[PDB]
Amino acid sequence: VRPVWFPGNPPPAHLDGSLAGDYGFDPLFLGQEPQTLKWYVQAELVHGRFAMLGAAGIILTSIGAKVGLGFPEWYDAGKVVVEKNNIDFPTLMVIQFYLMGWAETKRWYDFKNPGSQADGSFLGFTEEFKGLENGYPGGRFFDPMGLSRGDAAKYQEYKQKEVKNGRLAMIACLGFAAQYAATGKGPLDNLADHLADPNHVNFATNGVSIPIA
Amino acid sequence: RPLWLPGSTPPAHLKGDLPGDFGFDPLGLGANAESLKWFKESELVHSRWAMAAVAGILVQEIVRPDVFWYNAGKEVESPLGPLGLLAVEFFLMHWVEVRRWQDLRKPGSVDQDPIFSQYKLPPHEVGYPGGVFAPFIPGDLAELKVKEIKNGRLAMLAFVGFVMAAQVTGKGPIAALQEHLADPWGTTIFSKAAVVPGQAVAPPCKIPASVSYKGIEIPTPCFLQGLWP
Amino acid sequence: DRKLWAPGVVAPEYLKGDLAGDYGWDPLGLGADPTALKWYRQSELQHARWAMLGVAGVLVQEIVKPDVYFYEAGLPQNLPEPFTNINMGGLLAWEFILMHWVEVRRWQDYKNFGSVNEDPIFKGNKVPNPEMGYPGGIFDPFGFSKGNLKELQTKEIKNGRLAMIAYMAFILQAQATGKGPLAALSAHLSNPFGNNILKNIGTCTVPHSVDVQGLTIPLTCLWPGSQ
Ligand code: CHL
Ligand code: CHL
Ligand code: CLA
Ligand SMILES: CC1=C[C@H](O)CC(C)(C)[C@H]1/C=C/C(C)=C/C=C/C(C)=C/C=C/C=C(C)/C=C/C=C(C)/C=C/C1=C(C)C[C@H](O)CC1(C)C
Ligand SMILES: CC1=C[C@H](O)CC(C)(C)[C@H]1/C=C/C(C)=C/C=C/C(C)=C/C=C/C=C(C)/C=C/C=C(C)/C=C/C1=C(C)C[C@H](O)CC1(C)C
Ligand SMILES: CC1=C[C@H](O)CC(C)(C)[C@H]1/C=C/C(C)=C/C=C/C(C)=C/C=C/C=C(C)/C=C/C=C(C)/C=C/C1=C(C)C[C@H](O)CC1(C)C
Ligand SMILES: CCCCCCCCCCCCO[C@@H]1O[C@H](CO)[C@@H](O[C@H]2O[C@H](CO)[C@@H](O)[C@H](O)[C@H]2O)[C@H](O)[C@H]1O
Ligand SMILES: CCCCCCCCCCCCCCCC(=O)O
């Protein structure tokens, strides 16, 4: 009934169409055990949301590089920022692990004990850290505009768009790495080359993807 | 009830109680009651600020044509130095903004004059102080509440036009209208920019990148220039 | 019952003869869904009326100005005075604004039939709109609907389907020959065996790109022919 990844093949039992983006895809039954499935749900959402920010960051800075605005390529930005701004790499990295560490550990213990981060232990904040659902921590800090607490159907549709856009961005970031490794150029340089010659400038003629070509 | 798209069904949350309700909430931003209560005040504040700015920028261009509004901050010179002017502005706006905010958080808790006990705003609504702030009302208040929102939504969209026109043409609102009226077929953005699969063409930023002001050098960037058509 | 697209074929159950020009022809079964059939019928009406105007434009223009090539009339340098070398951007501005209004009005009629059948400004001005895709009223200024509308709807769809094929002939003939549709006929009649698709096919006579007032618009033929 629900569209599946391989039309004609019955959906796995541990996939009942309840989760957003449920197309019955678990060929290696990695999410067969429930608690494991809940963990993987937060994992896909966390991976996907970072990929969406990543992809949008690379695309904008790549546009600024395509035009004459002086934005470094994604694979060269890390060195430009540290060099031009004389920023100490070790300090920045440790600061990140401090901030991410705090946010990740609080998200981790919310998964282990749902609602346990809304006791007021953190500066007396209670409701902003209770969490609505696994991988969906609404409230007034994370959902400042209330889109999750208004129109249940709109919330379900938004969840479908989020997971699908996140899986697309995760595929796009794997594409940005593979294309840079195979071509040595930027992503919007690759799109301009293809658009110029789509039949003669593609992966089949890159001299790397197909070794016998 | 008139709607933004004739023949369409408005969002369930948009019944028609609020002034300016033409059933326009495609993203569903106002389906939460407490969120709608904030956005309603935000739309009013944005509207009134924009209406005064669009009026001021047009009048300033007529009375002071030589001065481009975009370049006014750096050009306007007063004996009260930039910092002295800002300090005064900061304290005055902090007070008025907190007083207005507290009205939204606890309605009816800030209608009393804090220096004169004899003066208190009559019971009212958030976004509509009235009382001393409303000495005269020329007509039905409900009708003017529709006029205020409609004239405000237009002004908010005009300012954004004045900004983009300034960065694309380097001219004030009137000077642009005249450029367009001189050659409409060659003054529209379509006649200034064009993106096709083969190539991309965008009008250049006509705003200096940095301004030198009292030995500081203020960064002056164009808005999302990279995504410009 | 009615005549079908072939002898022996059985019409799809969803094609019973309600819509005009119904030959029970849906080899790929795209009309099985009622919602799809409604949209596709509107799409077919749009492609038919536009294609009939296109066939008539290319033919009339070819007779009046036989020196102007239809395939390359869009070039501004070929625009009739006083529109020669007019800012193409400014021209697209008028078309986008006007078309966007009329197209969203017609579109809203599809979403909610009879929801936009009134002048949004001068209230009281209303089109009858007997059937979707058939507004009438100001759109039928001579009253030809007040008769056998169904039989006229058949002539419209049939002439439209024929014009849609013809227009694509004009395009492909233009790409392989480089001439308009009356010039091609003349070249054929000039030497039927000498000038025909057998020899004309295999060559795209269209450049790869053209500079329009500073912009390169990429151009392609409908088949890999010598370009
Ligand atoms: C005695 C040992 C002890 C240990 C080992 C921990 C360990 C931890 N506590 Mg914990 N706590 C401990 C005692 C106590 N805690 C708390 C109250 C809390 C709360 C309320 C929370 C934790 C949390 C955490 C975790 C934070 C995760 C992270 O990456 O943080 C590192 C993150 C940082 C931001 C590092 C802090 C700053 C860094 C040391 C450098 C400071 C730089 C500043 C510029 C300082 C400048 C000062 C100048 C300007 C005056 C973590 C595993 C958090 C958690 O994950 O809970 C689930 C959390 O929310 N603890 C109290 C008081 C009740 C404690 C003792 O009394
Ligand atoms: C409505 C039907 C229509 C048709 C069938 C044609 C057909 C033709 N025009 Mg023409 N035009 C049409 C309308 C218009 N033209 C022009 C302006 C021109 C010019 C200036 C030129 C032509 C040219 C041509 C010829 C070659 C084009 C080609 O190979 O395509 C190439 C097509 C593409 C690269 C892609 C175009 C299709 C695209 C999918 C359309 C939809 C895109 C959307 C508008 C929006 C896209 C942005 C999104 C992502 C937001 C060809 C015979 C060229 C010519 O004469 O060459 C000798 C030429 O130079 N036309 C205008 C503006 C007034 C039109 C307005 O409606
Ligand atoms: C948000 C509204 C706003 C803002 C930020 C500005 C800002 C500016 N205006 Mg301007 N103006 C506005 C509205 C505004 N105007 C309106 C509505 C009009 C029509 C009446 C004008 C007419 C105008 C003219 C004719 C001129 C300016 C000029 C100027 C510039 C320097 C003059 C100056 O301000 O010195 C100091 C200003 C004062 C000492 C006046 C004090 C403020 C009055 C007395 C109190 C009113 C308070 C009011 C009730 C508060 C509500 C307003 C609302 C926006 C919140 C400056 C950047 C001058 C300029 O362009 O310089 C180059 C100039 O020639 N404006
Ligand atoms: C489901 C399933 C089930 C069954 O059973 C089996 C199997 C099949 C195995 C499974 C799976 C599959 C798959 C496909 C997976 C995938 C994954 C991915 C791709 C991820 C990504 C992922 C990705 C991601 C996160 C991304 C991220 C990114 C980021 C952060 C950022 C970046 C960047 C930027 C902005 C810019 C500058 O320059 C810097 C940097 C830093 C460089
Ligand atoms: C939560 C919240 C709450 C409150 O209440 C409200 C609010 C605020 C609204 C919210 C928020 C939200 C957000 C933030 C969002 C974001 C998003 C994103 C970023 C996305 C991306 C997303 C992204 C994505 C998909 C991506 C895509 C991409 C792609 C396909 C790619 C393509 C390509 C490749 C590969 C390569 C080549 O060479 C080039 C190209 C062609 C380029
Ligand atoms: C029914 C169905 C179903 C089943 O299931 C199966 C199947 C088979 C799949 C299907 C079928 C289909 C078909 C056949 C289709 C066809 C189409 C076409 C051809 C169209 C045209 C279409 C066409 C058209 C519109 C046309 C258009 C045109 C126009 C506007 C015009 C233009 C022009 C002119 C005047 C002149 C100048 O100088 C130029 C120009 C400017 C260029
Ligand atoms: C966990 C999430 C993130 C995981 C992925 C992290 C990837 C990080 C990749 C870093 C690659 C470059 O690695 C880093 O390069 C910069 C380049 O100046 C070096 O930086 C060094 O010189 C610069 C000045 O030029 C200064 O920051 C400092 O003197 C020193 O740190 C760092 O010593 C080196 O560690
Ligand atoms: C570059 C690294 C610098 C050091 C950063 C350390 C930041 C603190 C991280 C501590 C996380 C501990 C979480 C508790 C363990 C658990 O959840 O099981």
Side-chain angles (χ1 to χ4, degrees):
Chain A
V1 46
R2 80 173 184 267
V4 293
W5 75 274
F6 191 158
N9 290 358
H14 56 275
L15 301 182
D16 53 1
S18 64
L19 293 167
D22 189 339
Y23 297 104
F25 178 79
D26 191 12
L28 296 177
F29 295 89
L30 297 181
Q32 185 181 188
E33 295 177 303
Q35 256 291 319
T36 323
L37 174 57
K38 296 171 38 56
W39 184 251
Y40 290 153
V41 164
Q42 279 214 14
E44 194 180 28
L45 288 174
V46 167
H47 268 87
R49 285 161 182 171
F50 270 119
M52 278 187 281
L53 292 167
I58 293 178
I59 295 177
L60 177 56
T61 59
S62 299
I63 290 180
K66 197 60 184 177
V67 299
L69 291 194
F71 285 85
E73 280 290 354
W74 67 269
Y75 45 83
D76 296 339
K79 182 174 183 178
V80 170
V81 175
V82 156
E83 297 287 4
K84 306 305 93 177
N85 312 154
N86 187 22
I87 306 179
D88 176 71
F89 173 82
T91 301
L92 183 65
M93 193 62 164
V94 169
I95 294 177
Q96 172 167 327
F97 280 66
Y98 282 9
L99 300 181
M100 288 294 297
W102 190 269
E104 288 284 79
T105 306
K106 296 184 64 61
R107 171 180 68 89
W108 203 350
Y109 277 87
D110 178 85
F111 181 93
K112 306 175 179 177
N113 188 1
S116 68
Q117 315 299 321
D119 54 350
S121 57
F122 184 73
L123 312 177
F125 295 107
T126 68
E127 226 50 44
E128 295 82 6
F129 296 105
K130 182 141 117 85
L132 171 59
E133 302 169 1
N134 186 47
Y136 299 95
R140 240 294 318 290
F141 291 173
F142 302 116
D143 188 14
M145 299 197 177
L147 292 174
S148 64
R149 47 186 180 274
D151 187 352
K154 247 291 190 177
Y155 174 54
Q156 302 300 333
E157 180 195 78
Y158 274 131
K159 297 175 65 178
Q160 185 70 0
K161 295 176 183 178
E162 187 181 38
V163 63
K164 295 172 65 178
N165 275 274
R167 293 170 178 176
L168 183 52
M170 284 193 277
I171 298 303
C173 292
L174 171 57
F176 291 141
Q179 295 177 192
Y180 173 53
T183 71
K185 307 164 61 67
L188 292 186
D189 302 334
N190 290 335
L191 175 65
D193 299 358
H194 178 72
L195 293 181
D197 222 351
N199 309 351
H200 306 104
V201 183
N202 52 46
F203 82 95
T205 82
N206 65 12
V208 174
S209 299
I210 310 178
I212 65 181
Chain B
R1 163 164 128 266
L3 292 174
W4 71 282
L5 189 68
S8 68
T9 297
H13 61 267
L14 290 192
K15 286 74 64 175
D17 303 347
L18 304 181
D21 184 352
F22 305 117
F24 182 71
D25 188 8
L27 296 181
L29 301 185
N32 179 282
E34 294 270 4
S35 307
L36 189 51
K37 288 192 288 296
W38 188 256
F39 303 142
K40 191 182 68 63
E41 180 84 3
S42 186
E43 195 175 23
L44 294 173
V45 175
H46 278 96
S47 154
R48 289 157 177 171
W49 277 114
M51 279 185 290
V54 169
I57 292 170
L58 289 168
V59 168
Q60 297 171 202
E61 189 173 4
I62 305 173
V63 175
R64 304 286 296 96
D66 45 289
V67 173
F68 182 25
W69 71 272
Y70 207 91
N71 283 359
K74 173 184 65 295
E75 296 182 6
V76 175
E77 193 290 328
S78 81
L80 292 52
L83 297 173
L85 275 192
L86 174 56
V88 168
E89 177 181 329
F90 162 80
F91 292 103
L92 268 62
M93 293 290 313
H94 201 278
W95 181 274
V96 311
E97 288 290 85
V98 170
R99 291 291 299 183
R100 175 180 62 86
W101 178 55
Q102 188 71 340
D103 183 21
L104 227 165
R105 310 197 316 115
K106 305 89 182 302
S109 68
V110 285
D111 297 355
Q112 170 57 234
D113 185 331
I115 304 185
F116 311 92
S117 52
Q118 52 185 175
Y119 307 121
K120 177 179 180 180
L121 263 58
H124 61 92
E125 306 74 22
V126 183
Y128 300 102
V132 65
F133 291 99
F136 156 51
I137 306 177
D140 176 12
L141 178 60
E143 177 179 1
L144 301 172
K145 286 194 174 186
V146 177
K147 296 182 174 180
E148 195 179 34
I149 199 57
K150 290 185 60 181
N151 287 261
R153 289 168 177 177
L154 187 52
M156 281 186 290
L157 276 175
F159 181 68
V160 165
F162 293 5
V163 177
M164 301 315 297
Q167 302 181 5
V168 171
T169 76
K171 307 152 56 58
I174 307 312
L177 183 56
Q178 303 171 355
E179 168 182 348
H180 178 64
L181 297 183
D183 175 18
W185 293 73
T187 49
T188 65
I189 185 58
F190 278 22
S191 57
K192 287 173 155 54
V195 179
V196 286
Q199 67 170 283
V201 175
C205 182
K206 307 211 71 56
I207 304 299
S210 71
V211 137
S212 51
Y213 177 77
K214 316 298 185 57
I216 279 302
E217 211 59 25
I218 115 93
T220 58
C222 253
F223 186 71
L224 309 183
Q225 186 179 359
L227 302 174
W228 275 20
Chain C
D1 190 356
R2 65 190 186 272
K3 290 254 295 186
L4 293 191
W5 62 276
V9 301
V10 175
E13 305 180 13
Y14 48 90
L15 300 185
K16 304 180 52 54
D18 313 346
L19 297 181
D22 184 357
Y23 293 76
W25 186 53
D26 196 3
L28 295 183
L30 295 165
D33 170 29
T35 65
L37 189 57
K38 295 184 52 185
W39 179 262
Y40 299 161
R41 188 57 172 183
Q42 299 303 306
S43 184
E44 188 178 22
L45 280 172
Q46 300 306 137
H47 287 86
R49 292 169 178 177
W50 280 121
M52 288 186 290
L53 290 166
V55 169
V58 179
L59 286 186
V60 165
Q61 185 284 317
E62 192 170 8
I63 306 172
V64 174
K65 303 178 176 179
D67 313 345
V68 179
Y69 186 39
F70 87 89
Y71 202 97
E72 60 186 19
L75 300 201
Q77 58 271 18
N78 307 342
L79 259 161
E81 298 291 355
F83 307 102
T84 309
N85 300 157
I86 197 175
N87 189 311
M88 290 298 298
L91 182 58
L92 182 70
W94 290 98
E95 189 192 4
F96 173 77
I97 297 291
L98 305 189
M99 289 297 302
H100 198 287
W101 176 266
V102 316
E103 281 301 85
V104 176
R105 295 283 308 194
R106 178 181 64 89
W107 171 77
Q108 177 60 36
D109 187 34
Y110 173 84
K111 309 301 299 179
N112 184 6
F113 186 63
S115 65
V116 288
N117 297 358
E118 183 180 8
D119 185 336
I121 307 185
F122 310 82
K123 307 304 179 53
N125 301 163
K126 269 170 284 298
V127 291
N129 197 4
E131 298 174 340
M132 188 174 297
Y134 304 98
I138 190 57
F139 290 99
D140 183 20
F142 290 107
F144 288 171
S145 310
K146 279 54 63 187
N148 191 347
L149 178 65
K150 170 51 67 64
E151 94 88 4
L152 294 164
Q153 287 173 336
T154 311
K155 290 171 171 176
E156 195 176 23
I157 193 59
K158 290 185 63 176
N159 286 253
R161 289 166 177 177
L162 175 49
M164 288 188 266
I165 300 295
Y167 194 85
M168 297 310 297
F170 296 179
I171 294 298
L172 213 65
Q173 297 176 170
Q175 296 181 354
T177 69
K179 303 177 175 177
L182 298 182
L185 178 48
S186 303
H188 176 63
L189 275 39
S190 295
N191 186 184
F193 309 79
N195 205 345
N196 58 353
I197 200 179
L198 260 59
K199 299 304 187 177
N200 306 155
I201 210 60
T203 63
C204 171
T205 63
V206 175
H208 295 88
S209 69
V210 38
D211 170 58
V212 163
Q213 282 175 354
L215 193 69
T216 293
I217 43 193
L219 308 180
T220 195
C221 271
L222 296 178
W223 87 105
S226 63
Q227 182 179 13

